[PDB]
Each structure stands twice: as C-alpha cells, then as structure tokens.
Amino acid sequence: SEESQAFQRQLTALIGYDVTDVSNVHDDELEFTRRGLVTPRMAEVASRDPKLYAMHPWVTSKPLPEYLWKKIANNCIFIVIHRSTTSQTIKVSPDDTPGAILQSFFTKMVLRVCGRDEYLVGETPIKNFQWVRHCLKNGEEIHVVLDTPPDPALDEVRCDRKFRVKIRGIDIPVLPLTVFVEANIQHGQQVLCQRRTSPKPFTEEVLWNVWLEFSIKIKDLPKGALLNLQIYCGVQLLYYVNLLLIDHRFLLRRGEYVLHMWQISGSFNADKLTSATNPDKENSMSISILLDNYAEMPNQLRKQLEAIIATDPLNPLTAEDKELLWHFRYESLKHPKAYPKLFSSVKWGQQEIVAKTYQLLARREVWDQSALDVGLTMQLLDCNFSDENVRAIAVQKLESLEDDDVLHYLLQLVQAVKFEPYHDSALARFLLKRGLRNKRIGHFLFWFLRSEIAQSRHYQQRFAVILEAYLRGCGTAMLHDFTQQVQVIEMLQKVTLDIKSLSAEKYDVSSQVISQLKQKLENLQNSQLPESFRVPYDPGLKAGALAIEKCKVMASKKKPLWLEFKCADPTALSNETIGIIFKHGDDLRQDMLILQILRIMESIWETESLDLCLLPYGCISTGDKIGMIEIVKDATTIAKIQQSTVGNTGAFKDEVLNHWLKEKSPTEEKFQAAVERFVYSCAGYCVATFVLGIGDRHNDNIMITETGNLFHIDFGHILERVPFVLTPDFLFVMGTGKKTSPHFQKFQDICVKAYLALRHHTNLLIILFSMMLMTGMPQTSKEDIEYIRDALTVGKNEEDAKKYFLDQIEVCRDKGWTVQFNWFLHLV
Ligand SMILES: C[C@@H](Nc1ncnc2ccc(-c3cnc(Cl)c(NS(C)(=O)=O)c3)cc12)c1ccccc1
Fold this sequence. Notes:
Blueprint: H1 2-15, H2 29-36, H3 39-46, H4 50-55, H5 66-69, E1 77-82, E2 88-92, H6 98-106, E3 111-113, E4 119-120, H7 130-138, E5 142-146, E6 162-171, E7 178-187, E8 190-196, E9 200-201, E10 205-217, E11 226-233, E12 236-244, E13 255-260, E14 262-263, E15 286-291, H8 299-310, H9 319-327, H10 329-332, H11 339-343, H12 351-362, H13 365-369, H14 374-379, H15 388-398, H16 403-415, H17 426-437, H18 439-455, H19 460-471, H20 476-500, H21 511-526, E16 533-535, E17 538-546, E18 552-553, E19 561-567, E20 578-584, H22 588-606, E21 619-623, E22 626-630, E23 635-637, H23 638-645, H24 656-663, H25 668-692, E24 702-705, E25 710-712, H26 715-718, H27 728-734, H28 742-759, H29 762-776, H30 782-785, H31 788-791, H32 798-815, H33 818-825
Helix pairs in contact: 2-19, 3-17, 16-17, 16-18, 16-22, 17-18, 17-19, 18-19, 22-29, 25-28, 28-32
The structure holds ligand D0D.
C-alpha cells in the first residue's frame, strides 16, 4: 500500500490516465478487464528468455531481395569489429551465425552496433538481421563493438419475451426545435431492430417515460449487440451513446442507467461505436433508461458464387448474394477469401442461425490449414464483425506472425481495438503478449497506446487498461526508459506551446523569440532533464544533451521547434547530431498512419525484388495535437531549390534541380546514383500518393536529400487537379517538353511494376485504407472510402491497369506548372 500507490502514480504518469478512477464507468468491465489481464501478462512474462528479451535482436526470416543480393561479391561481408580503438575488419558469409563469428574471432587472431542499443545475438544467420540489411541497402559498412551482454535482472518485474427499454427522458443542462430519441439494436454495423419515440419540444428536460418494445426476442440477442441511443432534432443527429445489451459476464443488462452522451460535429467513425460514456457530465447531454427484462451444386450457381467470392472488400452484398453464400456455406468454407462475405451473410438476430454459424466455426480445417492472408485476416477485425468467435479466428492467424511483421501491422492492429465490442478481447491480449515478448514491439505499443489515450475520450479508458497491463510486465529497465522519455516530452511540450503564444501567427520569428527559446533550453538541462533519453520513433538511438546553438524555432505559422541532440552513446561512430522536430498544430495520428502504409508498400515491393526508395521518416504522436518528427539530414524542399535561383516569384524553372544535384554530388559517379535514386524515389512517391489520393501537393511539401532521395512530408495538411506531382523540373532530371528519354523510360517501367505489384494486394490496401479512415480520419463517407478501388482499377485486367497509370502520367505533363502555380497562388 505504501509503495503500491507510489507505483500506481508511476503507472499513471506514464499512461496519462488514472485507471483506478471510477468516476466515468457504470459497470465492472474496465476493472474486470484489468483483473483478467494478469494471467496473460504473467504467462508471457514467465515465458520470456531473459537474455534474448534484454537484447531484443531485430531479425527477419524473409529472403534477401534480388536487388540487395547483387551487392555482394563472394559471400563477403566486412564487419568492422571495435574494442576501445583497436578496429579490426573480418570477412564473414551470409550464413554465419553471430556466435560463430565470435568463435572465429578469438580463433583467428556479444556484438553490438556502434552508437545504438541494437545487438546481433541469438541463433540467427547474419543476413537475417535488419540492421545488416539496412547497411547493405544504403551501401554502408557494418561497425560493431564487442561488449558484455546487459544484465537480465534489470528487467525485473514487481426468454421468449421481446426486448423492451424504458426511455425516461433526456437532460441537456443548457440549450445555448423539437427532439426525438432513436434506439437501435446493432450488431457490427447492421441494425437488427429499430424503434423511435414521439417528438417533444426541446427543453433542458424532456421526459417521455415510454416503453420501446422491439420485435426481436431476448433469446435472439447475440453477444456484442449494442443498444445505440440517438437524439435527433427537427432532421439531424445531435447526440449518441451505446450500451452493451449483453454484459461481459454474458448477463443481460438491466437496471437504471443515466448515460452521458457524445456530441456530433457536422459517417463511418469508430468513435461512434464506443461503449464509453462522455466524462464531461457538467456540459454534456444525458439520457435516462430502464431495463426491466431478465448435395451437389449447379455449375451456373457455382460461378455466381465464385463471382461473389472473387469481388473486392468494399463491393456490397445484395440479399440475393447473401442467401446464396449462406445456403452454400459449407462450400464457401473451402475458400478462405469467402469468410468475410460469408459471416456477413449471417442473420445475427436469430439464435438458430448463430448456432449453425458456430457449427460452421467448429469445422475449420481449411481456414487453419490456409496460409496467412493479413488482408483477409484484417477484414474480420473491422467494424463489420462484432462476433467474439468470428474475430477470434482472425487473431488465430495473427499468432503465426513473426515480430518483423507484427511491427509492420502494429499501428493498424492497435487501432482495430476500437472495433472490438468488449474491453477484454483476443486482439487486446494478442498485443499485450507480443509487446511483452519483444521490447521493440513493446516500445511502439506504449506510444501508440499513449497516443490514443492522450487524445481519445471515446477509447482512452480501454487503451489505458491495456497500457497499464503492458507496463506492469515490461520490466523495471523499460519503466525507467519510458519515464525518462515521457519527462523529456512533457518538458519540451511546455516550451513549444509557450513559445507559440509569444508571437502572432502572421508575424515571423524575431529577436524576441530566438532569445526566449534558447533561454528556456538552458534552464531545462541543468534542472531535471535526464542525461539520455531513448528516441521514441527510433528506440535504438539514445539522445544526449541539446546542442543549444543549433536549436531554433521554425518560420512557420505552427512555430514548431527544430531541436538537435548529441548522441548519448560514446561509441557512436560520428558526431552528426540527432535532429528532432517538436510540433503542436497538426494531428500526427493521421501522418503516422500514412507513413505506416508507406512502409507496408515498401514491404510489398520487397516481395517482388523492388526498391522504390521512400523515406517514411520517424513520426510519433505523443499527446494532444503534439508530437515529434525525425529530421532527415541534408534535406531541403523543392520550393527552396526553386527559391535558391529565382526567388519568391513563381515563374518555375526546369533545370534548377539538376544543378542542385550536380552541385551537391562530388563525383560524377555519385551524380549518376543521385539521379538513379531520384528516379526511383519519385516513382515510388508517384504510385503511393496516387493510390492513397494525396498526390496533388504543394512542392514545399515535397523534400529531397542531397543524395537524390525525394520524399513527401506533412500529410496533416491535405487530410485544377492532377493525379500526382511530376513537375517539369523532375522530368528534366529524367532528361525531358513532351518527349521520351533513357531515364524517363525506366521511370515508366518502375512505375508500372510498382502499380501492378500493389494491385496484387488490392484487398489488403483497400482494407487498410478503409480502416485508416474509420479509426484515423474524422474528416468519413462511403465515397471517401470507395475512392481507392477506382485508383487500384478493381475489375480491370493487367493491361488496362498498366495503361490507366500511363494516362495519369500524361495528365501531369499536360498540366506542367499549371496546378503547382495555382498552389503558389494560394498565398492570398
Ligand atoms: C521542413 C523543414 N525541414 C525538414 N528537414 C529534414 N527532415 C524533415 C523531416 C520531416 C519534416 C516534416 C514532416 N511532417 C511534418 Cl507535418 C512537418 N511539419 S512542420 C513543417 O515542421 O511544421 C515537417 C520536415 C523536415 C525545412 C525547413 C526549412 C527549409 C526547408 C525545410
């Protein structure tokens, strides 16, 4: 109790929410969930190799791509091993395990990367480490240092009756029309049954005091069924709130309830699904209710069926389709691609059908046998699927994911916890397991959970319980890491928002500001700022002290901070400072998602030996409209390269890039590479942005490295037309008006390969894009979500798609500077 409450403070300061608080819950669910998550926490904590956990070797079973193979001579990889300053080069083969390399080092005469908490340990071949593959791709040498493994002790752990509901009335404290209440019984996002009250004049207190008798029987209520209470005006929806009709102990909800309701701001938004109630009881609308009750197959049908099974995830099912899928459900089980369609053809408001559906879930040889399809697995974890067991088979497949892929899918998986009916779920538990098993995963699980907790009232309660359960088993080592980080974030937060209000949005940075900033940065160091702190978007990097002279406020309207830090690691093999941008202004949950998709797109292209050279820079959301961003070194915008010669006077030149590239590459050998890198990076960002529908961008939101690597930024803003940015300046680097060239040919090659590669995972991209808009972008209608199928040319064959994209290139060359110039004209 003495140091159980001191701990519960520690946990609360990390989470950013008090889980033990019971001021905004009307049942035992959050607490029961906390209780429930001890077993799975301890099961994974107990079954945890102390040494492999402590060194968290980042490894992958995927094959070395063909583009990355073809920079190896004769099984030669030169690992430069260090000790104090006695550097020594060793040739090893791709199959050589790190242990063998140590055995043949002491002979011929544990590893850790230089400047990083990243170890090359365990029974894995050297080629199957991600740090190695990173160095190979960027064309760099693999310097390590031999030191003793860190102590694993540091990671120590501490009725046939119809359903009926009385609508007593609603209570809005202050109005500054007529209203009616609508009560829906929902499962997934299909309304089973629906009843409505009569309208009454809108007062601070309306009382109906009426029984809404539904048709559906009480026995036919499925688990995961919501009572969705909605208030309408007079017709517009004003407030909403949800209540699990079947509670977490399989008990029908009964008794008196006074629910504080969520407001509407004028869609598929996952906040609309939440079982949480509005915590702001003072200002929010309230509602008061009472629950008193307590063979063969014809060939033409097979082809109608297979036509349905083949269709995309956003292609709706007619009732004709659904009767067919249902009737031939045992035939539909043999195809895993049918499963979302099939379980969406179930009448969930009938006990008999659900029973049969559960018999259908008893009989799953093929699903279990089948290879992991994440696109298909993911479909079963969205808003459409409320059934505990339908969802749980999906999580089953996720079990077989390796840590590499879990990282790929972690953000979208954390978002999908919102679609879960109950706080305690297989997915919730899955995440807790994989975060406790792996520190890299657990580091990112922390911030992703903290992200939502910090700016989601609808889901902070559920997430906070999950985060608390992670924190209680992640090990004293990391509790300290997370503490140092949080401290540093919250400290640098104060500075950013305080500095932002010290100057007007119209006025730029002045003598007033730069002095004030540098003053505060000096105050913070000598106070209670930790020596080092692990960089959230790259937990390998320990960051040290502020290089205060290099820190500044950026001439923006958002006044973000350009911060630079010394590497706290002494064995770091350079003095290049760690650059981080702190920014209040935009919501970086949107950017995070977009970047996560970019990485998924890189891994899709890796399956077909393609490198399209994207820079998904690090970007974490830390709190409410605050986050930080990785600074890409030696990088500028396309706008500034235009300004460098011309000025701030439109009139865009074509040859101003090539000069900049020839200016910033010492050798012609490197210029060739800096054009090669540009042609890929450009093409990758052309394809990627087109499909996502964020291709039409200002060119100060497009950046480039001095090594030619192009990359888009600031997806917050975007979230007289052109598919994507392919300006005449880019085309001159390719070597073009309106004619072809050696490099522009390979641009169109690379592009088409990239476009067609993505279309091979049409269903994955569609389900991720849908989920992204539902969990991530409050700014969504069906037509927003059903944009992607058009961009991915669903239905069209291989050839029409190849031609569809080439046409989109020709809109860019026909528009030239017209659209980009209109973007500059948006300075009035
Ligand atoms: C732009 C800034 N420089 C940079 N240099 C390197 N890497 C960066 C990486 C990411 C970003 C970045 C990514 N997403 C967002 Cl939402 C933002 N938002 S903002 C613009 O800070 O308000 C920034 C900027 C970077 C610069 C200054 C002056 C001149 C030329 C560019």
